[PDB]
Amino acid sequence: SHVKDILGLINAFNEVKKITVDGTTPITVAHVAALARRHDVKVALEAEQCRARVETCSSWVQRKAEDELQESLIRCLLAGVFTDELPATATRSAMLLRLNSFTYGCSGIRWEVMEALEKLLNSNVSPKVPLRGSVSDLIPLAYIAGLLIGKPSVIARIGVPAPEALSRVGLRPFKLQAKEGLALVNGTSFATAVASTVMYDANVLLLLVETLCGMFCEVIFGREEFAHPLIHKVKPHPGQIESAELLEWLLRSSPFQELSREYYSIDKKPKQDRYALRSSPQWLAPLVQTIRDATTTVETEVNSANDNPIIDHANDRALHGANFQGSAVGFYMDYVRIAVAGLGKLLFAQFTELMIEYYSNGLPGNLSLGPDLSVDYGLKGLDIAMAAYSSELQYLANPVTTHVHSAEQHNQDINSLALISARKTEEALDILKLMIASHLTAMCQAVDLRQLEEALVKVVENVVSTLADECGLPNDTKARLLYVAKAVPVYTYLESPCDPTLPLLLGLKQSCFDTILALHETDTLVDRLAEFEKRLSDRLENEMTAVRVLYEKVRIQGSKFLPFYRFVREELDTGVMSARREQTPQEDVQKVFDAIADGRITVPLLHCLQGF
Amino acid sequence: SHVKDILGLINAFNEVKKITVDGTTPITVAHVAALARRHDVKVALEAEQCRARVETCSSWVQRKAEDELQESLIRCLLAGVFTDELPATATRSAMLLRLNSFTYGCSGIRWEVMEALEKLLNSNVSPKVPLRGSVSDLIPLAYIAGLLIGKPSVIARIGVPAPEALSRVGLRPFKLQAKEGLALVNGTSFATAVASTVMYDANVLLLLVETLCGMFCEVIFGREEFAHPLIHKVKPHPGQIESAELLEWLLRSSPFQELSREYYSIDKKPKQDRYALRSSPQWLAPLVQTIRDATTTVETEVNSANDNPIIDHANDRALHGANFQGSAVGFYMDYVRIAVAGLGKLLFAQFTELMIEYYSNGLPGNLSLGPDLSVDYGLKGLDIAMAAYSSELQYLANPVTTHVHSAEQHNQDINSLALISARKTEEALDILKLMIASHLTAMCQAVDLRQLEEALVKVVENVVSTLADECGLPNDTKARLLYVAKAVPVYTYLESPCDPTLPLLLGLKQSCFDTILALHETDTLVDRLAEFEKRLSDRLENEMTAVRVLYEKVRIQGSKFLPFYRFVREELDTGVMSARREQTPQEDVQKVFDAIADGRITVPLLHCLQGF
Amino acid sequence: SHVKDILGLINAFNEVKKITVDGTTPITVAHVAALARRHDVKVALEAEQCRARVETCSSWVQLQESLIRCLLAGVFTDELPATATRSAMLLRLNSFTYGCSGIRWEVMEALEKLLNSNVSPKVPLRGSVSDLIPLAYIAGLLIGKPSVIARIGEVPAPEALSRVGLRPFKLQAKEGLALVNGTSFATAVASTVMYDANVLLLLVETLCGMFCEVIFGREEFAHPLIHKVKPHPGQIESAELLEWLLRSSPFQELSREYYSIDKKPKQDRYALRSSPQWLAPLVQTIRDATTTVETEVNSANDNPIIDHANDRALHGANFQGSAVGFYMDYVRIAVAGLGKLLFAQFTELMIEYYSNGLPGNLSLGPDLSVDYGLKGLDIAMAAYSSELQYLANPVTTHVHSAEQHNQDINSLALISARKTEEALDILKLMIASHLTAMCQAVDLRQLEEALVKVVENVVSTLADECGLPNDTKARLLYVAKAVPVYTYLESPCDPTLPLLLGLKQSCFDTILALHTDTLVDRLAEFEKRLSDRLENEMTAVRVLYEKKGTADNNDALVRIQGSKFLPFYRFVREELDTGVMSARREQTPQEDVQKVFDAIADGRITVPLLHCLQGFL
């Protein structure tokens, strides 16, 4: 299962200490992301393994020479403009990728240059690089080359001008030998760097979305049979089988699935769930497959000699090709952006169902607790933003690769645009993070609302029961009134429980008339019904208030989504949203988003999945 | 002419001191941009003019009341997430626009709230606002409302939490009266703010592009008849007539147009210019019209009561409508983005012609001066970036308004997305600025190359002439050799003037054979030709070098584009690009871009156009 | 107002007999569409004044076939239809009338003759970046190329010239170029596109009024002060038309009564309330693109431009279709916005939570288990909108550097125009469905009124019969008035459905108020006699309505007769011969919507549209 593969990525991202660069050990997107994001992670360039072929190649090039031009290529390519930059994370990833390309011994670069790139990486030195200019990555790579040769105009980050930056790590400016200038700039390092972190995040966020479909089922009162393995066996898209497999496991023995069954046994209400849940495995299938296949394509590029000419020193020749062409990455970035847009549309439609009382199977509109709804609009602001998020996301998922210009004196009459496409997919993932943060926040709210709903319904039954006794009502009357306390969705009347126009009293009044026709000492029975109604408005609301305030001051405890609710509630320190909670939606969702952005969300994710 | 209208905008942007906010005087996009960008520009809210209807409306609302709910609306809408923000410029513009909307006396807001917004603006106080969440601008406007009521979680810029921010300007937190909460958040202020500065820049950059088509004609050796008024009279799109009118005026009496005529009189070479020039007025026509019409639509929105309900106090009623719907702005932002993309495609194709010797009518590939081309790649890096720029730009110009989601419990089943579309058009203008900066830099390079070409050709004629005399060559021989010194494009042989395989010597050798067959004392004539060839390689290159180095250490002086070349060369302190110029392309284009971004480019623009 | 202009366009389309081609009288998009679609419309090339400036140009000018040959390069894959090709012939002919092309007058007469005799080459769909290749086929026809196939309402080109009394031309200096060097095809398709865009725009605006009537909207959204204070011209004018349309509506009156019972949403949803603001840019885009396309129609789009008066040929690029290309991109975005509006409106109408009393999917039932109403049309509406939004991506952003990098910018106008045309085809589909749905809604609203009346009569007469007190009669009558009939029509006496539920609440409340054994006996007798009478009398009034196809005194009140939208309902029901949709109606949704679509497609919808708008100023 892809699920195990993503878990493997997450573990590797967390646990890696040293990234081995040896020309044989594959570098994964988790490795690229770990170096980018965790500064204790060091590069380990292994001489024993690859130095020999690098030096042979290097010397072969020197051989052909013997049998300034380089600097003037670098100068020509320091043509970017600071509008906004490629971030240090992307730049350092590019430096790792270029260094890796060099390990295959096809480039002719000196080993000493490779050791300098290793040293720059482990000392957190990187040039400031303009965001735009590559059609895929001459111009952005020139800034790394410029650093290496100590161009004064190239500004470098440490944790100053390139020369000073080199001083501080005990390097001196390099004097480029034949081919070294071209070898430094002639790669796909930046497109593939951004694509690496993009693919890492896409994998994590994919698994996160799949998992939260289970949590949506629990809070929306879904029917878990949508995840039954036979359904998928018979339409066997691998992503469909594997996502359904996860969901079945997540929802097996769910205490909320028990409440759902109970709910559909009273007043049998829609027979099937709407598509945002029932159709999630079919929807996810292509998305899973796109993200997984694009991860293999990006890793292949990470682990390639993307350079030209390719030196086959073994056979005394330079081969003229186009390994600098980032098309494999460019096209897959376009496909992943479309898939991420499909991930957002799924979240938007789920979130939409949750906000609407007609579709939420008992929940209050906007997930407002109230009880006073005139001063509690609940998650309406988040509902609006979700549309805003999805709308921009669908727009971002148009392709970039359809906009190929004939470039560089028509020499580059096809070009990948991979870096541009990678940036748009990156930006699309930013929006997906936003959407995931809001969706999880909404579901924790919905968890609280379901547990509160269960306790309130108990209070209403207890109040109706005991008052029926006090008022001396027939058993026939009691049973009819209790069935109503059971059947009526509490959120439809919580605002004013004894309002005679709201659904509780309406049901009670229907039953009181029905009890009157069935038992027809008539006038005393009417007196006792009247006294019941009177004591109900003495007592009911007060006791609903007390249980709610007590809640504000156990079913999720049996749920596999416990780690998520616990993380959001206890660890991030939040509570049910209401008029009595000072914190704005922003403040609560900000915390969830920050934990998604920085990887802390992986802890409750792996807890949730322990044993799958 | 739209040209005068844009000049009017530029003048107003430069000259305004006080923005009058009085409910009658229109606010233009130049006013919105001036307040945004120049902090000496103050807001002037005129009581005399509009306070009376504001207070009537205010009191009318109080009347209906009398006959917290507001805060809870604000709290619900503080639902943005800091991923990246709306910049202070956009936020302050939004504050101006909301304040303006209130001047029409339809909103019910208190005058005191309006004075607070005036005070906040003139003291440079503004809330930090999340970039995303609006489908057009509840959520972003909530942050202004939050500031006004002193919400602690709302952070404010001064030049701290909202309460402290209010202290510092002598305001106290407001206690919202009936409708005030809704009135604060129920507008199009942010979409229209971004759209205002977008439209201001689009106008300036449009005129800038039209004008630089004239400069492209001059350096590419174009035929100015493409701008002849009869051509356009007969296909009378207003933008076609007006752009052509500008170009005809720019190129009338051009000293470069004289050189162009001379150029086509030797070896009559293409009969017509390629489309990037000859078809520019037809291309510009719809672009001019889109930008001008979108400017009227955005200004109409600036000067509107975008709120709901609309209070008709005169007739004792509240009217229920949707003036909060930013559709007029949203759709026009989509059209302007497409037009900006057409502006970039025009620049890309012009820049492409300039870089390619087959299409540049005598200029060196990549505009390299050399003479040694193996260490001078010229503007190749900029040529590559231009493709990168155009490619992303064409991608940005897909519509946003086609991505309307059914939002907010399906209440908002149509929504404008104007703010999102405005941001994409904004980002598209960023790329267009980049492209304009590179194009102007390329043309100053091309100016130098044309003036150098003219001086070098003179040196070659003088050297050929005087050596012919020294060597005692027949007049027949001299005239044939001089015609060759005249006809042969100097940049085709500048690298090695006496290389016998390069076009100078090839032409000379052809003529020497032809003179031999025509005059056929044979052996002495051959001796003198041989001595000519020998003295040519003693002397020619040295004297070409001397005139070039002298140049590096008058036709643009008669050109209407003089202010541009002078600005770029003298004022920004640059020179012909070569191996002998330390500064990278980045450093030179950065200066041009910065002057475009900050409005300094308007000075040479208005100089160029004085008297049109 | 733009409404007057579109009316003016519809009238010229219907009324024109002769299109004057003279180099001074503008040709409008309605002329272009008329020539295309109505074969009795002839071309009149006017010799006086026009012929003189043409011949001067012709003689001042005083190898060609090798250009034509090179350009006969398209592939039959599909075709530009005859309508676009004849339109293109008209536009090229018109270009020549300004006396800048150098073409011979006799060529112009031949084109006039070919147009009036309905002769046109079959032209492949694709190949223009804008219109050398497609125009080549018209040139090919004129010069008698055997390989060019011509229609005459099919023979090789020289056979076709023969039949109308022409001989193949021998092209003179420049004539080859003047024939292929124009924007005639992009502008032809753009013209019929713009004509249809105007008509469909006005049709959608007008139908927002009908939507208001059947959804129970609040016409206040159209109040002129709302729009005066946000004065986008298209916002002001659409609201102005809507205010007039909705003034004195008997459905708006029924609506006001509806919101007085249980005062239910205070404002309408955006699909109605925000329609003028939404329509604003759409109106302005369609109107401005019309001006632009007309300017192109009435241009010399050709190169070189001959300035004989000054004795020179001018070298420019009037062959560049950019003004048309960009505006086609914009119009397509605007047509996408009109479809989104229709989709949103159609969506509200199908959903009982948003339709203010209407049944889900506009199902009549009563038996909903065999009547899914308009659900198939509701599904199709999503399909239509979805493809439409996709079609509205721009074409002008896909400019290739073409023809040995000579055409390094090119407009793609014909490709864009074709995409906008395809978008309009979908909009017609959406309009046909929406209007069909609103006629169903009209019927459901009229039936709703008559059913409520029957329930009221039954409750009332049974109250008296069973001897119920006044407090009781009044309470029960109120429930008959307030409970939406469609929520219980499936089984009116079902104790778990909303009628009996409200009746039972009322009975308990009357018993509590009058506090007996006898009262209970009478209420029980009331309830059981309700089962005797209610259903059969609801059925009878409904069956009577369905059986109706000239009205009796027995027939239910038909509010539509006092509505401005009568012309639309009457056209769809009487003239197109349809009826309320239900399980008892044999016809499929297809068959009904087809008739509406065909009438939109062929211009017949303009009759009820002009009736409806009669007297607007």
Side-chain angles (χ1 to χ4, degrees), chain C residues 295-314:
Chain C
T295 294
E296 192 74 25
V297 167
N298 298 289
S299 67
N301 40 85
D302 192 30
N303 192 66
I305 297 293
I306 310 300
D307 188 13
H308 47 252
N310 286 274
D311 190 26
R312 54 191 296 209
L314 297 177

Side-chain angles (χ1 to χ4, degrees), chain A residues 68-69 72-73 75-84 130 132-135 138-139 143 151 153-154 337 345 348 352 355-357 359 365-366 374-392 394-400 403-410 412 415 417 420 423-424 427 430-431 434 438 578-587 589-590 593-594, chain B residues 68-69 72-73 75-84 130 132-135 138-139 143 151 153-154 337 345 348 352 355-357 359 365-366 374-392 394-400 403-410 412 415 417 420 423-424 427 430-431 434 438 578-587 589-590 593-594:
Chain A
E68 184 40 50
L69 161 79
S72 83
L73 177 64
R75 303 194 355 179
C76 138
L77 298 175
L78 296 167
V81 176
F82 295 102
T83 294
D84 251 352
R132 301 184 165 105
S134 181
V135 301
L138 297 168
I139 287 174
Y143 287 82
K151 265 271 157 169
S153 69
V154 167
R337 199 155 62 256
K345 181 40 53 76
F348 173 77
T352 293
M355 300 292 125
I356 298 161
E357 64 269 35
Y359 307 125
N366 307 298
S374 72
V375 288
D376 186 3
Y377 294 104
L379 288 59
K380 182 180 283 317
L382 303 196
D383 190 30
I384 300 158
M386 286 298 281
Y389 299 158
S390 188
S391 297
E392 185 170 342
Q394 310 309 308
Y395 160 92
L396 290 174
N398 292 309
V400 163
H403 301 281
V404 178
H405 287 50
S406 178
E408 196 234 321
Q409 302 171 300
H410 309 299
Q412 304 184 36
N415 52 83
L417 303 174
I420 299 162
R423 290 171 36 233
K424 298 302 157 184
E427 193 191 337
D430 287 334
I431 295 174
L434 256 5
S438 290
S578 82
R580 291 159 306 280
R581 170 168 180 77
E582 298 289 293
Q583 292 75 33
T584 57
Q586 159 186 352
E587 291 174 84
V589 182
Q590 193 73 54
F593 175 88
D594 292 347
Chain B
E68 184 40 50
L69 161 79
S72 83
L73 177 64
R75 303 194 355 179
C76 138
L77 298 175
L78 296 167
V81 176
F82 295 102
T83 294
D84 251 352
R132 301 184 165 105
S134 181
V135 301
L138 297 168
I139 287 174
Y143 287 82
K151 265 271 157 169
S153 69
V154 167
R337 199 155 62 256
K345 181 40 53 76
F348 173 77
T352 293
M355 300 292 125
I356 298 161
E357 64 269 35
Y359 307 125
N366 307 298
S374 72
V375 288
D376 186 3
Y377 294 104
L379 288 59
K380 182 180 283 317
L382 303 196
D383 190 30
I384 300 158
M386 286 298 281
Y389 299 158
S390 188
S391 297
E392 185 170 342
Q394 310 309 308
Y395 160 92
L396 290 174
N398 292 309
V400 163
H403 301 281
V404 178
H405 287 50
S406 178
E408 196 234 321
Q409 302 171 300
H410 309 299
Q412 304 184 36
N415 52 83
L417 303 174
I420 299 162
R423 290 171 36 233
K424 298 302 157 184
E427 193 191 337
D430 287 334
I431 295 174
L434 256 5
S438 290
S578 82
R580 291 159 306 280
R581 170 168 180 77
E582 298 289 293
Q583 292 75 33
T584 57
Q586 159 186 352
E587 291 174 84
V589 182
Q590 193 73 54
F593 175 88
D594 292 347

Side-chain angles (χ1 to χ4, degrees), chain B residues 440 444 556 561-574 591-596 598-605 607:
Chain B
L440 179 51
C444 295
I556 191 70
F561 303 99
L562 177 57
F564 281 116
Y565 174 90
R566 207 177 54 242
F567 186 78
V568 170
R569 284 288 180 265
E570 297 178 49
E571 200 172 324
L572 300 186
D573 179 37
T574 61
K591 292 159 162 190
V592 180
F593 175 88
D594 292 347
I596 287 162
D598 78 17
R600 276 144 52 220
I601 201 64
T602 62
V603 178
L605 179 58
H607 196 161

Side-chain angles (χ1 to χ4, degrees), chain B residues 2 10 34 59 67 92 101-102 118 131 155 223 246 251-252 268 274 330 379 386 390 399 421 444 457 491 503 562 605:
Chain B
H2 77 276
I10 285 172
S59 288
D67 265 64
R92 287 187 67 247
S101 280
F102 292 161
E118 169 183 49
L131 182 68
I155 298 312
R223 266 59 65 87
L246 179 61
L251 301 161
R252 195 191 304 158
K268 202 157 55 183
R274 288 173 188 89
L379 288 59
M386 286 298 281
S390 188
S421 188
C444 295
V457 163
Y491 289 112
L562 177 57
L605 179 58

Side-chain angles (χ1 to χ4, degrees), chain B residues 35-294:
Chain B
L35 168 138
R37 284 163 191 184
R38 297 168 55 212
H39 297 283
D40 42 308
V41 176
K42 300 298 182 186
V43 187
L45 173 67
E46 295 310 350
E48 201 76 287
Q49 211 80 356
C50 62
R51 151 106 103 153
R53 82 178 86 92
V54 172
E55 234 116 27
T56 300
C57 200
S58 207
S59 288
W60 182 95
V61 169
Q62 273 315 113
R63 237 70 303 163
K64 298 318 176 163
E66 298 150 16
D67 265 64
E68 184 40 50
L69 161 79
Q70 306 299 306
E71 287 164 347
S72 83
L73 177 64
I74 298 315
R75 303 194 355 179
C76 138
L77 298 175
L78 296 167
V81 176
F82 295 102
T83 294
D84 251 352
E85 304 169 13
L86 282 153
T89 54
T91 307
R92 287 187 67 247
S93 294
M95 295 167 77
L96 172 70
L97 266 35
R98 198 84 213 101
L99 166 58
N100 201 42
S101 280
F102 292 161
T103 66
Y104 307 113
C106 299
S107 295
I109 204 86
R110 291 166 285 159
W111 185 258
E112 289 66 22
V113 173
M114 294 167 68
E115 299 176 311
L117 284 175
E118 169 183 49
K119 175 74 158 174
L120 292 166
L121 281 163
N122 296 337
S123 311
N124 279 264
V125 179
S126 63
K128 285 169 69 89
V129 184
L131 182 68
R132 301 184 165 105
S134 181
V135 301
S136 310
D137 287 309
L138 297 168
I139 287 174
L141 282 164
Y143 287 82
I144 295 164
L147 173 59
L148 277 168
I149 66 165
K151 265 271 157 169
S153 69
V154 167
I155 298 312
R157 290 184 209 92
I158 315 153
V160 295
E164 310 212 50
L166 295 180
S167 295
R168 303 211 170 193
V169 300
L171 287 165
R172 314 200 327 280
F174 287 90
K175 192 69 172 156
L176 298 181
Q177 304 310 303
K179 192 178 193 292
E180 299 199 314
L182 191 72
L184 283 171
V185 306
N186 218 191
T188 60
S189 308
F190 277 93
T192 312
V194 176
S196 293
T197 49
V198 157
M199 289 320 300
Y200 178 74
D201 294 333
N203 273 284
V204 172
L205 299 185
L206 172 73
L207 184 56
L208 209 31
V209 171
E210 307 187 53
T211 301
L212 298 185
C213 294
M215 192 176 183
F216 177 75
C217 182
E218 283 193 344
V219 302
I220 204 78
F221 284 177
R223 266 59 65 87
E224 77 276 14
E225 85 198 81
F226 82 94
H228 193 287
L230 179 71
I231 294 168
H232 312 284
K233 182 277 188 46
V234 127
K235 177 153 158 169
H237 301 288
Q240 193 176 324
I241 285 174
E242 291 169 27
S243 63
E245 195 187 27
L246 179 61
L247 292 170
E248 185 286 325
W249 181 83
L250 287 167
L251 301 161
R252 195 191 304 158
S253 297
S254 165
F256 286 99
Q257 285 326 110
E258 284 173 22
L259 263 196
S260 179
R261 265 182 301 271
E262 236 33 286
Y263 176 79
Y264 297 100
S265 71
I266 334 274
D267 289 351
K268 202 157 55 183
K269 285 172 189 175
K271 181 45 204 152
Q272 298 185 116
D273 299 326
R274 288 173 188 89
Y275 286 18
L277 175 69
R278 172 163 56 101
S279 162
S280 58
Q282 295 81 1
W283 196 253
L284 288 161
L287 279 17
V288 169
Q289 292 164 208
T290 302
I291 283 154
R292 297 307 302 151
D293 295 343

